[PDB]
Design a protein around this ligand. Structure first.
Ligand SMILES: Cn1nc(CSc2ccc(Cl)cc2)cc1O
Length: 133
């Protein structure tokens, strides 16, 4: 019910430090270049307890479906095989991905009419701002 503020179709309007985030994650040069060019839409829906987040771009369409607090396997757009858990903490969707003894966290929050996505890998944060399509 509260997760309703996230539901809809969103379009990327700005990005900061995404290349640096991808470097910290271990993404190679060619994938960074093509992924960094993408202007994805993010489509979020809910059906009962199941949340679906789709990312659609010229680089790589992805779709994850999950229940809050319940681990799932995810193949990321850059082809990492990760174990993911997504929870809703104080109104923020918090997505933790674990692989090869590493961890990254993606937070999605509503701020004004934006959906702000913060991606953190060690000390490196990328901020990506989406608005309604
Ligand atoms: C935060 N984020 N992630 C994507 C998918 S593309 C992607 C590429 C490389 C990495 Cl490391 C993560 C994601 C699009 C977007 O706004």
């Amino acid at each position: 019910h509260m997760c309703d503020a996230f539901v809809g179709t969103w379009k990327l309007v700005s990005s900061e430090n995404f290349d640096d985030y991808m470097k910290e994650v271990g993404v190679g040069f060619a994938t960074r270049k093509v992924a960094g060019m993408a202007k994805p839409n993010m489509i979020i829906s809910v059906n009962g307890d199941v949340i679906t987040i789709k990312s659609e771009s010229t680089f790589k369409n992805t779709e994850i479906s999950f229940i809050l607090g319940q681990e799932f396997d995810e193949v990321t757009a850059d082809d990492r095989k990760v174990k993911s858990t997504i929870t809703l903490d104080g109104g923020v969707l918090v997505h933790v991905q674990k692989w090869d003894g590493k961890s990254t966290t993606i937070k999605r929050k509503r701020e004004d009419d934006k959906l702000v996505v913060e991606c953190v890998m060690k000390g490196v944060t990328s901020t990506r701002v989406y608005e309604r399509a």
